[PDB]
């Protein structure tokens, strides 16, 4: 009905973004573990596997966040990387979910 149509139209999925770490040949594995623990609340075990994924797969997803939070994570991780003089690049892509 009219009320039910109003419900339907208000169920557009949230714009969500994957926060991604991209591999490079200069950033220490230990530093990537540190990043994952500091900014994403991963335990050492989970942080280690994701870091391995970065190294062997080329990139890995750190988690999925609202646009606003995702941009905040990217800013922080990149800042942390540069101040430690590493090229590690944290970026975003739309999840579609």
């Amino acid at each position: 009905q009219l009320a039910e149509e109003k419900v339907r139209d208000a169920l557009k999925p949230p714009s969500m973004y994957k926060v991604i770490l991209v591999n490079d040949d200069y950033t220490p594995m230990e530093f990537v573990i540190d990043v994952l623990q500091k900014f994403f609340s991963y335990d050492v075990e989970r942080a280690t596997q994701l870091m391995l994924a970065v190294h062997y797969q080329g990139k890995a997803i750190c988690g999925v966040f609202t646009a606003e939070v995702a941009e905040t994570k990217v800013a922080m991780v990149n800042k942390y990387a540069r101040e430690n003089e590493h090229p590690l690049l944290c970026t975003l892509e739309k999840a579609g979910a």
Binding site: D25, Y26, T27, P28, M29, E30, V54, H55
Partner: peptide, 11 residues
């Protein structure tokens, strides 16, 4: 990424 050096001292 860069792997850390292994630790060894007379084993």
């Amino acid at each position: 990424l860069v792997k850390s050096k292994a630790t060894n001292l007379l084993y």
